[PDB]
Amino acid sequence: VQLVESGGGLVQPGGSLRLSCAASGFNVYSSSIHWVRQAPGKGLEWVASISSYYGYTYYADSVKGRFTISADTSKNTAYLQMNSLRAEDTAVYYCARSRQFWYSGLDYWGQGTLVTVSSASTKGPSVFPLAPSSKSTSGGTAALGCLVKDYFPEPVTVSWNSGALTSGVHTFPAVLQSSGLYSLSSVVTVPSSQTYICNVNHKPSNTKVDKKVEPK
Amino acid sequence: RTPPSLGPQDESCTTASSSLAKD
Amino acid sequence: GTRVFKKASPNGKLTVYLGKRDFVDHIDLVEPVDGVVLVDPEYLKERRVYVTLTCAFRYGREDLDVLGLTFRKDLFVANVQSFPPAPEDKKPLTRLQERLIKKLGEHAYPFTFEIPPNLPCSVTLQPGPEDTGKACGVDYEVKAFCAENLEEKIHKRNSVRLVIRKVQYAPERPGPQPTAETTRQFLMSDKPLHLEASLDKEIYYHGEPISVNVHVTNNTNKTVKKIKISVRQYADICLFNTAQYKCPVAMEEADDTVAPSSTFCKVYTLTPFLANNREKRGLALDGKLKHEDTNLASSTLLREGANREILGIIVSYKVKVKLVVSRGGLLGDLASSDVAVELPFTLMHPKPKEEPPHREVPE
Amino acid sequence: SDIQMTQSPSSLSASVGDRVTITCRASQSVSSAVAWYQQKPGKAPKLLIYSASSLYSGVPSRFSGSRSGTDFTLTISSLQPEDFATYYCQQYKYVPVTFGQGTKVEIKRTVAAPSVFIFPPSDSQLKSGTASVVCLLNNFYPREAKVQWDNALQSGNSQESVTEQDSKDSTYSLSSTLTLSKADYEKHKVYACEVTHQGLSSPVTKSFNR
């Protein structure tokens, strides 16, 4: 059984977006459906609930007048219409299923979809290397990496050797500068050997930047 | 005579719970 | 097993304790109603405390313009003198009662009620907007009051009233698969119009879709212009006389057509739910504790036996499939050529693990 | 008048096999409508306990909940590797349902030594107009640390970024990227970083001169 969410992206402040959550494998008139929002590193906020059996919808006070939850029970999907979007409303929006008779916690969650709200411009990343030296080596192991800087809005996957480096690798949680852009770092241990480039598939700008780490 | 009743039941909870120790 | 329910009389002089508010009617044994009543002699002055359990029918009078006004005709009343304990009576306690008096001391007196089977289950009839009083239907209530004798008028402040529910859940083993067929022969052919239908299973849960396999074989001159599938709530009601209604709670009207000398097979899926049935005042619903929403009433399970015309509201469900047959023929449209069949099924909640709440997530 | 579900402690460290208790207090009575959820980072929350003491179908029997009035506790009896995550309580008696802040449940490890490296900024970058020097801390435990970057002082420019606990060896890793404008990078080429950890009280500063 699956809750699979859709329709998350970047939009400017005061704009609008609609999230779709295609359920699969249970009966919408015996399950009430919810939207739960996770600000990055800040925990869980319930935003809205719909119950088709009874015809009722419920809203987080912080969200009345701007968000509308709705269901199309033939297509087996629920919708969250999001209007007048503050930067605050940035979060991962989870679709979550509950049991109509009777509510016993949220027993199934969707893998989430990312909603970003800012007056930025979807800059792609800039990729720079992190060349090893005597100062990057200890114990026969030397450490190399890539710096992925100044991108928008949300994700960057970063593989090494296109998938051929498994161990010793650390791709760090992104940080954001006062400039409003993200930056991110990814390192790896390939001791004293040779090694490959980093595959940096930034996804929103449709850019694949691949930079070979050349020591030193 | 069939006894009458008037007006709605109270919206606030009139019924509470208490603890009971397991044996 | 850590929490118990409690309610106090307004002057705090009486306090009823229970382990639960829903008591299950497994058709041969409905589980007993056991609790205690806590008498405070710092305010007690009344010389005797009784506990009565009542099963009652509640209705408004049709010809009255008095909103919120209802009446409560009794169907089953038990009486138990709880204070003081009358000898020529030694009953053992339940573990529930045992722990309660360990918690409260000898001022808590037990009361045990046995619901006889073949009594109606808690059922509420859907109010319309012209209904602002207590929910009509069949409700259970334990009452505790203090008075001198059972003749004496008792006082509201010296009493405490507590709504409970008698309920049933789905059986373990589903029935045989629901199947139905009819064969209609007209005047001058003898070649039949045959209707066969089936449900995918015998037991459904609330909110759950229902798939009806229809198979029609027209060997006649006539043509069916539409097929109508509907889930119907049957309610049998008996207080001083009997009443019956048949109310569709879900319905599909397909424009499928079956030509002469044709066959036809389609599956149809309906799903009963309350949201598109709010206008149907008097539609039966599962027992309301106070005023919260409840589902379309679950099927009543009876002990197979002679029709004892059970008091209360007896709920059942059937799918109906009707074919709407053209009226050419030598009889004009003076008579109907329609052909229909009905498929019974069972609509209930599954046996739970945790008891059901009073409200669900209140606002 | 929303219900605040104050979870405690904010974070706690323990090692495999131990018994652990997280607790959640409720601004007022929520009867027993409390749930407990496990969430491993980057993944959707998962349900453990509803109705305050009922194990969710599929959950290992090593999880238990219980209630004492407004105080609600989840406990794991025999901690295990599968069980290292964050944990939220939830009250669902009243709209809106409200979760707790979370309690981080990390592995207790034998202290490990931070392998510290420094990465001067690429020539492909100061061409672009800003500099970024990256101090790396690798495969170490416990995760608290302080990186101190004309070799006197600076602040307001660094931004650290840590990772989660590595699956197998329970070690953390950390990065600190001091940012600078190409203009400033060329004046006072006297910067380095100083690392302060349990695994060594004697700091190990790697340095670069430019």
Domain boundaries, chain D: 5-107, 115-204
- Contact residues for C87 (Cβ-Cβ < 8 A; gap 6+): none
The distance of B3 to chain D (nearest Cα, Å) reads 35
User: Cβ of D94 under 8 Å from any chain A Cβ?
Assistant: no
* Interface mutation target, options A27, A28, A31, A54, chain C, most CBs of C under 10 Å: A54
Residues of D in contact with C353 (CB under 8 A): 54
Q: What gap in Å lies between CA A70 and CA A56, rounded to an integer? A: 10
For residue D171, which of D133, D127, D138, D123 has the smallest C-alpha distance? D138
Q: Which CATH superfamily is domain D115-204 in?
A: Immunoglobulins (2.60.40.10)
User: Cβ of B21 under 8 Å from any chain C Cβ?
Assistant: yes
Q: How was this entry determined?
A: X-ray
CATH class of D5-107: mainly beta
Residues of C in contact with D54 (CB under 8 A): 353-354
Q: What gap in Å lies between CA A12 and CA C168, rounded to an integer? A: 54
- Strands, sheet with D63-68, edge to edge from the N-terminal-most edge strand: D5-8, D20-26, D71-76, D63-68
Q: Does the annotation flag C246 for ligand binding? A: yes
Nearest CA in chain B to C101: B20
Question: Which residue carries 């989430």 as its tokens?
Answer: A112
The overall longest dimension of chain A from CA atoms, in Å, is 69
- Residue C301, Ramachandran bin (φ over 0: left; ψ between -120 and 50: alpha; else beta): beta
User: Within a 13 Å sphere around the CA of B20, how many CA atoms are in the beta-carbon half?
Assistant: 21
Q: What gap in Å lies between CA A167 and CA D167, rounded to an integer? A: 11
For residue C138, which of C244, C297, C30, C17 has the smallest C-alpha distance? C297
By CB neighbour count within 10 A (0-12 exposed, 13-18 middle, 19+ buried), where does C226 fall?
middle
b/e C301-336 (16+ beta carbons within 10 angstroms → b) = beeeeeeeebbbbbbbbbbbbbbbbeeebeeeeeee
Chain D window 148-187: which residues touch A at a Cβ cutoff of 8 Å? Answer: 159-163, 173, 175, 177, 179
For residue D32, which of D76, D100, D89 has the smallest C-alpha distance? D89
For residue C32, which of C53, C5, C9, C7 has the smallest C-alpha distance? C53
Are D32 and C3 within 8 A, CB to CB? yes
Chains touching chain C through at least 3 C-beta pairs below 8 angstroms are A, B, D
Evaluate whether D5-107 and D115-204 have a shared fold: yes
CA D102 from centre of chain: 11
Neighbours of D159 (CB within 10 A): 15
By CB neighbour count within 10 A (0-12 exposed, 13-18 middle, 19+ buried), where does C17 fall?
buried
For residue A183, which of A148, A214, A152 has the smallest C-alpha distance? A148
By CB neighbour count within 10 A (0-12 exposed, 13-18 middle, 19+ buried), where does A118 fall?
middle
* Continuous segment of H or E residues that includes residue C101: helix C95-104
Question: Which residue carries 């007993």 as its tokens?
Answer: C32
Chains touching chain D through at least 3 C-beta pairs below 8 angstroms are A, B, C
User: Cβ of B1 under 8 Å from any chain C Cβ?
Assistant: no
Beta-bridged to residue C286, according to DSSP, are C123
User: Cβ of B17 under 8 Å from any chain C Cβ?
Assistant: yes
PDB resolution in Å:
2.5
User: Which residues sit directly before a break in chain A (C to N > 2.5 Å)?
Assistant: 193
Chain C window 2-21: which residues touch D at a Cβ cutoff of 8 Å? Answer: 2-3
Question: Which residue carries 């405690």 as its tokens?
Answer: D8
